[PDB]
């Protein structure tokens, strides 16, 4: 029993769309907060000077935002599966999407 037997279900398209995944994750949490939104989207400016992309950002500094996936890729192989953590695991649903 290899993947060549399992190929006829894994290649199915319903392994690969998140529209169903955003249904049930919504229908139990009617609205979670959108917190420190950092790298969720691209912003474009009419700038060409790269100092404008440099001094306008690094001049002031909050307690630094750390996104979800950046603190996914330092947690080791058991700390994810420990019940101290929700926010690293409520936002993992099936591993192809993120």
């Amino acid at each position: 029993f290899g993947y060549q037997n399992a190929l006829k279900s894994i290649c199915h398209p319903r392994m690969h769309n998140p529209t169903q995944s955003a249904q049930a994750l919504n229908q139990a949490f009617p609205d979670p907060d959108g917190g420190h939104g950092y790298g969720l989207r691209y912003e474009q400016t009419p700038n060409m000077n790269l100092f404008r992309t440099f001094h306008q950002y690094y001049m002031g500094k909050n307690v630094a935002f750390v996104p979800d996936v950046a603190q996914k890729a330092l947690v080791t192989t058991e700390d994810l599966l420990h019940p101290t953590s929700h926010r690293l695991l409520r936002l993992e649903v099936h591993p192809f999407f993120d």
Binding site: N49, F51, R52, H55
Partner: protein, 78 residues
Amino acid sequence: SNFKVRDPVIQERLDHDYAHHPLVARMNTLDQGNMSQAEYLVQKRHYLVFLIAHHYYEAYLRRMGGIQRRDHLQTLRD
């Protein structure tokens, strides 16, 4: 600042330190126009940079033209 790079400190006034050269008068050809007195010498310095690269590249193609025949083999009679 917050919009350029820090300038590199090189000694000023290359024209006053050396002027017996044909490309010195080519700096005087550019006009001030809207610039101030001190800010004219900044962009006058960048125009000298443009004069050097055009000057040596013209001598470079004479250098990389390769040795020819008729001016060479005639001299090889001795």
